[PDB]
C-alpha cells in the first residue's frame, strides 16, 4: 500500500515487462464500469502480483493504458487512450511513479509504442493512422509520418539499428522503416491483416509477424515459413532471452504458445480465461515466462527448455 498508490488495480491487465533486476512492471486499464482509466505498477516481488497491498510502487493515469514499455531502468513510456504519449519515471527511492511529461500529439487512441536502440527516442502508432518519432529528452515530436491508410496496429524498433523499425496496420501493409532514406518506408510483400511484430534478437534482417487469422510467420528482408498457431488474432510475439531463442505467442483465443526456430510448438497454456495481452521472460530464470490477461491473472509458466 505505498504512498499515492491506488488501493484498487483495474481489472483489464494490458502489459507486463520485466527489467534488468527482475522487477515486474504492470499496466492496467478499466475497460468497463463508471470510470475508464488506468494505472501503472512496479512489483519487485513478481509472485505478489497482481495484489495491490504487496507492490513496490503504483500510480493512476488519467486514461487507459493501451501499451507501454520500459525506458531504461526507471522510465515508463505509455500509449494512452487520450491520444497522448506519456513518460513516467521512478524516484531515486523507487517508491513513487511520477509523471515526466504528457503530450497530446495524436488525434485518437495511441495503440502501440516502441523505444529505439539509442534509448533516447521512441516511435508510436495510433488509430489516427499516423506514426510519430519522439525525442524523449526534448519532449517533442521529431517526425510525423502518415504512411498507412488505416489504424496502426503495431510498431517495433530495431534491436540495434537506431533508425530502423517495423510497423503494420489494418491497411494490410507491413512497412520497414529507415529514417536515413528520403522516403523512409518500404512495403514488405494479399494475406490476412497483420496484428503483431517481433524482430529476431540475434538476426539483423529477420522478423516474425502474426495475423488476425491466427497465423505466425517468419520473414527475411529478402528471399517464407508460417504456422497456424492460434484460432484467433495473434496479439503479440516475444522472443525468449536464450542463445537460441524461443518464440512466445499470444492470442484472443486465451492461449499462450511457445514455438521453436522452425515455428513448431513446444508449450501451450490455457490458464487464462480471457484474452492474453502481454508476455515477458524473466531475466533471472530464462525458463520462466510471465503472462497477463483481461481475467486479471498474472501467470508464471515454467517453459520446458
Amino acid at each position: 500500500l505505498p504512498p499515492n498508490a491506488p488501493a484498487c488495480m483495474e481489472r483489464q491487465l494490458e502489459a507486463a515487462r520485466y527489467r534488468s533486476d527482475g522487477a515486474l512492471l504492470l499496466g492496467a486499464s478499466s475497460l468497463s464500469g463508471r470510470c475508464w482509466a488506468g494505472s501503472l505498477w512496479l512489483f519487485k516481488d513478481p509472485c505478489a502480483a497482481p495484489n495491490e497491498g504487496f507492490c513496490s510502487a503504483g500510480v493512476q493515469t488519467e486514461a487507459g493504458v493501451a501499451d507501454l514499455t520500459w525506458v531504461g531502468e526507471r522510465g515508463i513510456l505509455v500509449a494512452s487512450d487520450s491520444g497522448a504519449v506519456e513518460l513516467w519515471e521512478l524516484d531515486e527511492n523507487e517508491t513513487l511513479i511520477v509523471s515526466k511529461f504528457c503530450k497530446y500529439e495524436h488525434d485518437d487512441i495511441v495503440s502501440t509504442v516502441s523505444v529505439l536502440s539509442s534509448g533516447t527516442q521512441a516511435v508510436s502508432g495510433s488509430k489516427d493512422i499516423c506514426i510519430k518519432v519522439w525525442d524523449l529528452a526534448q519532449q517533442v515530436v521529431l517526425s510525423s509520418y502518415r504512411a498507412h491508410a488505416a489504424q496502426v496496429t503495431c510498431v517495433a524498433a530495431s534491436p540495434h539499428k537506431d533508425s530502423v523499425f517495423l510497423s503494420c496496420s489494418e491497411d494490410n501493409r507491413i512497412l520497414l522503416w529507415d529514417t536515413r532514406c528520403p522516403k523512409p518506408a518500404s512495403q514488405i510483400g494479399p494475406g490476412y491483416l497483420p496484428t503483431s511484430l517481433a524482430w529476431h534478437p540475434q538476426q539483423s534482417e529477420v522478423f516474425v509477424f502474426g495475423d488476425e487469422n491466427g497465423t505466425v510467420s517468419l520473414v527475411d528482408t529478402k528471399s517464407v515459413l508460417s504456422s497456424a498457431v492460434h484460432s484467433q488474432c495473434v496479439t503479440g510475439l516475444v522472443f525468449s532471452p536464450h542463445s537460441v531463442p524461443f518464440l512466445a505467442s499470444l492470442s484472443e483465443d486465451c492461449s499462450l504458445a511457445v514455438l521453436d526456430s522452425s515455428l513448431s510448438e513446444l508449450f501451450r497454456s490455457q490458464a487464462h480465461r480471457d484474452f492474453v495481452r502481454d508476455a515477458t521472460w524473466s531475466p533471472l530464470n530464462h525458463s520462466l515466462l510471465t503472462t497477463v490477461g483481461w481475467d486479471h491473472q498474472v501467470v508464471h509458466h515454467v517453459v520446458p527448455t
Binding site: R34, W36, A185, S186
Partner: protein, 625 residues
Amino acid sequence: RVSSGRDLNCVPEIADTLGAVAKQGFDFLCMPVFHPRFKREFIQEPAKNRPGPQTRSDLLLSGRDWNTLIVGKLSPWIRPDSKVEKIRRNSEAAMLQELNFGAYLGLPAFLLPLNQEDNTNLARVLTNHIHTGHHSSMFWMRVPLVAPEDLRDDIIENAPTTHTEEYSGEEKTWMWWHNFRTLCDYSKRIAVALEIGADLPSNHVIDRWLGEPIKAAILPTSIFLTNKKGFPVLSKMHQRLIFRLLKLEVQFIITGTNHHSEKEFCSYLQYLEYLSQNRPPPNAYELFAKGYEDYLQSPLQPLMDNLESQTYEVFEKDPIKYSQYQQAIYKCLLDRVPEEEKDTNVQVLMVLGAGRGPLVNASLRAAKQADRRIKLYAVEKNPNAVVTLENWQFEEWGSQVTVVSSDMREWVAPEKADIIVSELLGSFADNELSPECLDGAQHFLKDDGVSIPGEYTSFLAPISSSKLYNEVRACREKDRDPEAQFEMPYVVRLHNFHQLSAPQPCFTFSHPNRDPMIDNNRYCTLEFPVEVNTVLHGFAGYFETVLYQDITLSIRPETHSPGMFSWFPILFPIKQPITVREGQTICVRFWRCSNSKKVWYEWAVTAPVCSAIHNPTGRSYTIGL
C-alpha cells in the same frame, strides 16, 4: 449561432467529460457507448463468458441528456465485412449489441463509418436493426471527402502515390455512400457525416455531395491553420466550403486533440461562430424563403379551386411584382392613346382574375402616372374574393370599376376591351390553364387589343437530389396507386439539390392567339449536356413571361426578377433514379395533354436510359378545366 458538437474517443468519466464539453460551448458530444478497446467475444469459450458489466450504466445521465446531448459511436474493432469469418460473426453480434444499447438509451443519433469499398454486410445488419421496431433515431455514416489511401504521405519508396488525375477514382468515397444507402433502400434514418481533410479534392469531388442528406460536417483540428496571434483558422478554400455548409444548416463536429495548446480549446469553435456571423444577413427573399426549403407543396389550381383569403394575401405581399404590372400597363396606355387624345380616348381595361384587387389598383395607379383615362372591369369567379372586390368598389373605387362575378370563359361582356390584364400563371407558366382561360376570353378583346401578359415560356433543368427523391417517396397514401407520388409535380423552394444542365425552354404561349386552329397541346424533346458524374431524380421547372415589350417577370434563375418573392420553382420527379456519367446527354420528353374536362402533363426520359412514361392519361395528376 452554429450548432456544434465535440467528438471524443476517450471518456474517463461521463459527467466530468460532458460538463467540460459544455463549458467550452459545445451543444453535444459524440462518444463511445462501450469502451472502444473493449473487444467482446460472442461464440467461443472461455472469453464469451467474461463477467460483466459490459459497459457503463444508463443511470449516469438523465433521460433528457441521453435523448439530446449524446451521439453514440460504433466501436472501431467492429468489422462486419472482414474477410475472416469469425470476425464477421462477432462483429455482427457486437454491432446489434451496440445499436440496441443506443436505442435502449434513446440516443438521437448513432455514428458508423464508411472507411472501405465493401460495406455490404454492415448495411445488412443496419437495415435489420432499422426494421426491428419503429424508432426515430438517426444513423450518421462517417465518410470522408478523400479516402485515407488517396491522401497518405508519399513516403513509401516502393509504392509511390498516383500523381495522374483519376476523375472517377477521386470520387470513390461518394460511391461508398451511394452503394451503402442503395442497399439500405434509401432509409430516411440514414444520413451523411462528411469528414473534411487538410487538403480539399478537386471541386467536382465536392459537388458530388450536392443533393445528399448531409446532417453533419466533421472538422479535424489537424486542418486548422494558425494566424499571427496564434489562433486556429482555416484556408480561404476551407472557408468557402464552410459557408456552403452553413447554407445546409448542418451540424459541425470538432474532432481530434488541441494542437494550439497555447490557446484554450474553445478557440476552434469560436472561429466557426466568427465565420457564421460573417455573411450577408437574410436578403428579403432568402430571409422569406427560409422555412420553406425543400418543403413539397401541391400546386395551386385557382381555376378548379377557390383560393382562401390568406393565399391571396401571399400573392399581394410582393410589390416588385405589381410595380412591373403597373409599368406594363403604363407603357401600353401611352402607346395606344396619343397625347392629343388624352381627354377623349377612354380605354377599356379588363382584369381577368382579379382576386382581391391588386391589379385593379395597379391599373388605376398606371392610368394616373400616364395621365390617361380608363374604364375598368374586375372579373373574378371566386365569389369569396368578389366579396372583397365589392366592398372595395363601394368604399373606394366607385363607378370607375365594374366588378363581374363570373368565369371569363362564359361572361358576356357588354363591350370589348382595349387591354385584358391577367395573373393566371403558375410556377410552370401554363400549369393553371392560363392559355385555356385567355382563349375563352379573347372574343371580347378588340381586334387590336393587347393582352398583359403577352406571352410566357416554361423552362426545365435536370437536377440531382437524393433528399428530394426521398421526400417524394415518402408521399405514399393509403387508397391510391403506391407510386402516384412520383407522377405529379410539386411546388418547392429547391435547396439541397444539384442542377445538372442549363435550363432550356419547354412550352410557350402567346396572347392574343390570332391562329385560326388553336391547339394548346404540346410535345417537346430536350437534350441536356451533362459534364458530371451524378444521379438524376427529377426536373426543376421555371417560367418567364413578357408583360409588355421589355417589362417581364421571371423565376428562371439566370434571369430571375430581382426582389420578387412570388413563385417557387416546381419539381417533376421520376420513379427511378437514373445514373448519368460525365459527358452524357440527358434526353427528356414532355407532353401537354388535354380533354374537354382536364389538362395534364406526361413526361419521359429517353437517354441515357429510358424511364416509364409518367402520368399516362393523367392517371395520377390532372388540372381541372
